[PDB]
Amino acid sequence: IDLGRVIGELIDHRKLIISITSVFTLFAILYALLATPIYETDALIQIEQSAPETALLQSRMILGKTIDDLNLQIQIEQKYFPVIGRGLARLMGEKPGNIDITRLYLPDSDDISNNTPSIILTVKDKENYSINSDGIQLNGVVGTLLNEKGISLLVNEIDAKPGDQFVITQLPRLKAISDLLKSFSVADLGKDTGMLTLTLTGDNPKRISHILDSISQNYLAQNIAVRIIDNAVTDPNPVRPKKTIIIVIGVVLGLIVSVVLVLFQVFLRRGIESPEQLEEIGINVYASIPISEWDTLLAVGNPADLAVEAIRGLRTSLHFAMMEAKNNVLMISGASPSAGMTFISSNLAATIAITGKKVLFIDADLRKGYAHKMFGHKNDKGLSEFLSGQAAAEMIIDKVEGGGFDYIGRGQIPPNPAELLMHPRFEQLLNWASQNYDLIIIDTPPILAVTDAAIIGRYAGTCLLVARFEKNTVKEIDVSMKRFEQSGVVVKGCILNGVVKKASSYYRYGHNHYGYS
Amino acid sequence: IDLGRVIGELIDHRKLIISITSVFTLFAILYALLATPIYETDALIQIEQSAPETALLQSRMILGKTIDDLNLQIQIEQKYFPVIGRGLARLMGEKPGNIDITRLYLPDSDDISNNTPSIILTVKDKENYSINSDGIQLNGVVGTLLNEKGISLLVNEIDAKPGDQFVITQLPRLKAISDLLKSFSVADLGKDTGMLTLTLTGDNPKRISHILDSISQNYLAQNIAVRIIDNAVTDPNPVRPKKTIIIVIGVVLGLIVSVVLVLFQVFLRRGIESPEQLEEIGINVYASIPISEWDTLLAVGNPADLAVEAIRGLRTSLHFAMMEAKNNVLMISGASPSAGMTFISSNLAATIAITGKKVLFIDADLRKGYAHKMFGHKNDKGLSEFLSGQAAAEMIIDKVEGGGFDYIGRGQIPPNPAELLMHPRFEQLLNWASQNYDLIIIDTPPILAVTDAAIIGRYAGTCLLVARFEKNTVKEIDVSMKRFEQSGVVVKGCILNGVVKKASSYYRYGHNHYGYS
Amino acid sequence: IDLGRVIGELIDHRKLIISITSVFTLFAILYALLATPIYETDALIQIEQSAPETALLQSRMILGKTIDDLNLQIQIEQKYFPVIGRGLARLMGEKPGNIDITRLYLPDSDDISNNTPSIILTVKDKENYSINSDGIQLNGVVGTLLNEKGISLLVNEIDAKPGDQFVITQLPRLKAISDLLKSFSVADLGKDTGMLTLTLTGDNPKRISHILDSISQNYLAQNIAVRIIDNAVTDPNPVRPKKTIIIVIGVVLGLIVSVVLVLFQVFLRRGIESPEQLEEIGINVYASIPISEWDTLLAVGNPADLAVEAIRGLRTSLHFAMMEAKNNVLMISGASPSAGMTFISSNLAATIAITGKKVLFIDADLRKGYAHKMFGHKNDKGLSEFLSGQAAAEMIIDKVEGGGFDYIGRGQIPPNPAELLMHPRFEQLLNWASQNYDLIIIDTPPILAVTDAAIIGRYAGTCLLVARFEKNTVKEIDVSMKRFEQSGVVVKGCILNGVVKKASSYYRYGHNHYGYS
Ligand SMILES: Nc1ncnc2c1ncn2[C@@H]1O[C@H](COP(=O)(O)OP(=O)(O)O)[C@@H](O)[C@H]1O
Ligand SMILES: Nc1ncnc2c1ncn2[C@@H]1O[C@H](COP(=O)(O)OP(=O)(O)O)[C@@H](O)[C@H]1O
Ligand SMILES: Nc1ncnc2c1ncn2[C@@H]1O[C@H](COP(=O)(O)OP(=O)(O)O)[C@@H](O)[C@H]1O
Ligand SMILES: [Mg+2]
Ligand SMILES: [Mg+2]
Ligand SMILES: [Mg+2]
């Protein structure tokens, strides 16, 4: 590997890299724009030590005095059904509603798990409201207290629009103190001075300042039975979330994920990349057919296609490689199915037929052949019917419409194709056709699947394999050629099919293909 | 080894990896859901030092004062017979019962080992209960004290359902103090301040808070003859077990166990993996027969099987490898038993017989041959009977029903098979059959077990070995071929049998097999 | 790589390096000359400790006392519409205007985001002024206070020219204190002494000194209910921006950017650099044609060109390489389009024609040939018309005007050029022309694009490829030559075209070209 290789691999997978990075950045931006802002307030306390004073400030005594003073055991949250409703409501510019409660006494279910009883309050107007705990609907009025169904509730100054819902929870005193202690910190700022820097974070900028003022005043009143230099004020800029660092982390995470995925794909790739890989082993590659992006013959629908140009190059190579051959029969086979054998055989027959030569195309794939469908057919009396003795050599030959060559179809699918192909009638047909045609092209099944290609290849002067660009492997093609040669069939060379242009291929070998029109 | 190799090995053993990891995670989840939760309580003590105060708090004086005050030498546990009954009862939502005892005096057996006398109390109703120490049944009533059989017991406020059992133990005072000291810790929290952070853990959230309050009050009363800032309250969230870390440890442990097992299997694997291993040594592999998942011939029951397709490929290879041979006799042997010699020989005979050729199948395994069973037989007058002189060459030949070839069975098992096979009658039979049949296939025992294959191979023009996919070894096959060649028998090649597709094999060599139907 | 290579690469890309470095230095100089200068003032405070005194100086108490004393919650900035207007106005020598405000009360919109109400004040003369907040125009007079539209404003001593605009912002008290605290620092200077070094930075040298004096006096008056040794004076030399370090950083950044870009281009370069690269593979390079910077023939317009001299060298090489050839037909082809095939063929024909020989130039590029345009033409009856049977060999040959050789044009573009070139009429034409001309030069399309060159090359005794200097690749040329040789065409050698002189090429190989006139 080198700089050219890595740059080419990054250019090839650019769509994957961009998509993954964009998804990660979109998630990061959504989180940074929908997360609830958290504000911070601070105060300054002067001590005439401070090491016992920190633990006395963070003690349940002071914190619970604050909880009782400010009624922090009553928890009120506006109801947004999804996990993004609050964020989108804040983004839409809707101000958050709030209600003032000074008295709340729930029936204290106190079951095994739900230690915090909760109700839902729905606002009907500026004055009245509705309450439902477990489906039990009640109606209340601001001002007058409610004592019904074992529930005591006092709501004042509803500041919201009608239809809003609020979840009212009565959490235990220790839970409230634990929350306050989790959001409250004390420092010394000099490690020796009497200055104490109290800090408190929360999602309500006014409430956190009120809470910190209450804490400071309670501590002062306790200690005088300590000077407050700065009363608590809230920094208007939220301390969390940190949007820029969140987005940067998202970008970097997306980039590293994309890079590792690309590396895994590159290292797990095993297919053929260029004809040079085949020619290292000693396999002559006679053509490289590109992918045609255009049941019709390509060489007839679009004679000016790049794939048909590559097939004409293959025809020119064959006109020289097929001389000094024992006969005029050419067999095209391959390693794996759907490698391009029928495509290449049919289009090669078309391109050789337009040059004024008589061509016969035999579809000796007695299992899954569709040449009759691709050419327009009379399905009766095919190769199977001829081989099984129930047809003559003259009634099986047809004419391609937009072609210019004859063809023989597979007929009906037999139960014994490999035993049919061993009959001497096949060699009789080939010997008869070699005297009436200038070229016979035989299409065969793969060799790594069945043995029909190796049975047929005995009567074929020239045999070529078709290798798929990314699917097949060099070892696979070597295995196919050695299995052919083990049965007495000499494979002339190979044909790489379905080639596409890649930047890594350019930085390793080169272009090796152009357009000229 | 490389990335492709390791990924293939992980993919192959994925069932083992998943099973082991799932078992480990299931055990971890069961432990984390059935373990008893352990709560924690804490208090704050202010000292006007604290280094002698820690050791005075953790002293037997204070701890035993607490034990005597709270009657902690009476141990009560609800009876759950299994080691998971308590956990499953807690999961099922059953509240744990408890009883209040203020007086307990067991007869104090005080034997060599059982220093803690214990009894079992069974609840009958809200008022009465039953007591049995060593089978001695007694009945008691809440309120009135019991003084019978040297046992004094006072039970108040039974809060449980009838049928519950409780193990009541009177552990010694030092044992109670040791337990309390094990569950009790003191810290300074400033290393210089007068603040002390007392901590106590246990499985009863109310009891641990009561115990810590008693400890604090006893220490205060002792010291005044120290300020208590925070009385003990229990954190409702248990501190143990830590479910998430337990589950993560379980997952990681399962993964590492699976990986090490996979590595051991990979490094201890010795069998053949591909025909390339055999061809490195110079052994021509003529076929690779896959495992057929479908006493019948495969080539007759399922002629369209993948194994029968591979056997047809072998037939095509043999039609070319068996030319220029001294005669038309083919001997199939192998290295080890149950390698596939009879399977391959019989199916090869069937596939060569369907092509209109006359085939004779001789079962020259005079020890454990079952070809007659597989073909349908007249067990009389087999090869043994012919060789021992008590039969003619015409009465030993039979007909396969769904075959199309003749066969000769082994007859009765002789006591001297290797000495029977050395008789000139065997060569006479082969010479006679070579004039009446187009092909003779001889099935033989292994060569690493007996010498019959090497005796027979003298009269066979072509000899092929059958190697099992994972069982046999390259060295084993080389030993077999050299033992054959040492006795004057030239082995043409090999046949790999029982091949299966593996991801490691793909990432090392390739597919090398396909389906086409 | 070595010193010669790196020096040559730096010399080649000197224009890029200089341009990038100059752009970076220009940006750095513009920033350092347009950034607003920031001045610094300092004072000395003596303490009779100082560790609590630092935090008491930097406290909201003292800072807010200063804010209230100096009315620092009224923010006034002169209006410059661009982000460089202030800098360019300072550079132009314009003194910055200022206004004195002692009373400002905006209606306090206090919306969701814009917590700082702001207005714009436009100066009409030394006395009057205009005010517009959101389009509401008001007129005021220095002296008399304004109480209109809920806005209270008092402006004194307007010192500016008419037409100036000022943005007047009433930022909140905490924001003002935060700004002052951000620009204010305290140190001890001895870590033990009572000396305190107060510092304050800002863009107004007089205002920052006044602010620091107010801070010092407020702290003194608070502490006496501390000695001021040095009252605050402003250092006239701004502390920021640091112009020299900014410019040096710009220079170094430009240099490193240029170097990394040059390294990337060098490592991603893949084209041919010298004939030695081709001759390593075994390809005889017969010429190297330089770029001609001078629809006309070069060999006729400028016969004394360096490119025409290189073509005469090629002619001298050909007069020796074309002996012992089967005929007098020369085919010039190449790997990729726009490599120089038509240029080289036409100019070579001209240079061989001026030596008194009869030359025929055939334009066998039946797809995109423009030789008729380059020579002056009668477009009728070209090579296509001859090959398609509708013309004679005598009506297709024309005369080049400023040439001295005949030529055959492509005629009309046919739909089947490759099938036309396979007609025996082409060989008949070549055989006829080889008896009437001393040399035939055939121009062909590329070979990596189409197969026409490989069809034609059968009848050509000598074939040469044209390689482009930087565009084509050694692997590309090897692929072209092997594709030619695979179709039975023997390529004699290569011709490097479009060569330019480079310092890296000199320090690797040498000059290899000179001028002599
Ligand atoms: N270079 C190619 N460009 C476009 N289509 C192709 C190409 N090669 C094969 N195909 C098409 O993809 C399908 C599979 O190829 P096919 O030749 O039919 O399989 P097989 O070789 O096993 O007989 C076919 O529909 C074929 O037309
Ligand atoms: N590729 C295979 N697929 C399915 N079954 C097989 C295969 N090879 C062997 N067997 C079966 O496994 C058993 C053992 O093989 P066998 O040929 O009888 O042993 P041996 O070679 O020693 O005579 C047999 O029942 C056989 O049918
Ligand atoms: N060494 C060169 N100096 C100046 N111009 C050149 C040189 N080589 C090619 N060209 C000009 O650049 C253009 C492309 O070259 P051309 O020979 O026409 O392409 P092709 O080889 O594919 O037929 C032409 O206009 C040509 O005149
Ligand atoms: Mg096909
Ligand atoms: Mg057997
Ligand atoms: Mg051209």
Numbering used by the authors:
A (entry chain A), B (entry chain H), C (entry chain B): 17 to 64, 85 to 261, 409 to 477, 494 to 716
Quote what the paper states about this structure.
Wzc, an integral cytoplasmic membrane tyrosine autokinase protein serves as the master regulator of the biosynthesis and export of many bacterial capsular polysaccharides and exopolysaccharides. Wzc comprises a large periplasmic domain, two transmembrane helices and a C-terminal cytoplasmic kinase domain with a tyrosine-rich tail. Wzc regulates polymerisation functions through cycling the formation and dissociation of an octameric complex, driven by changes in the phosphorylation status of the tyrosine-rich tail. E. coli Wzc serves a model for a wider family of polysaccharide co-polymerases.
Here, we report the characterisation of the structures WzcK540M2YE (Y718E, Y717E), WzcK540M3YE (Y718E, Y717E and Y715E) and WzcK540M3YE_N711Y (an additional N711Y mutation) corresponding to different phosphorylation states. When Y715 occupies the active site (1pY), Y713 is bound in the same pocket. The structural and MD data reported here confirm this hypothesis, showing that the tyrosine most stably positioned at the active site is the one immediately N-terminal to the phosphotyrosine (or the engineered Tyr-to-Glu mutation). We show that it is binding of the i-2 tyrosine to the tyrosine pocket (where i is the number of the residue positioned at the kinase active site) orders the tail between the tyrosine at the active site and helix α23. The presence of the negatively charged E675 in the tyrosine pocket we suggest is incompatible with binding a negatively charged phosphorylated tyrosine (or glutamic acid side chain). During the progressive phosphorylation sequence, the kinase domain is a rigid body. When the octamer is viewed from the periplasm to the cytoplasm, progressive phosphorylation results in a clockwise rotation of transmembrane and periplasmic regions relative to the kinase ring. The movement of helix α1 is directly transmitted to transmembrane helix α2 and then to the periplasmic domain and, in this way, the phosphorylation signal from the cytoplasm is coupled to the periplasm.
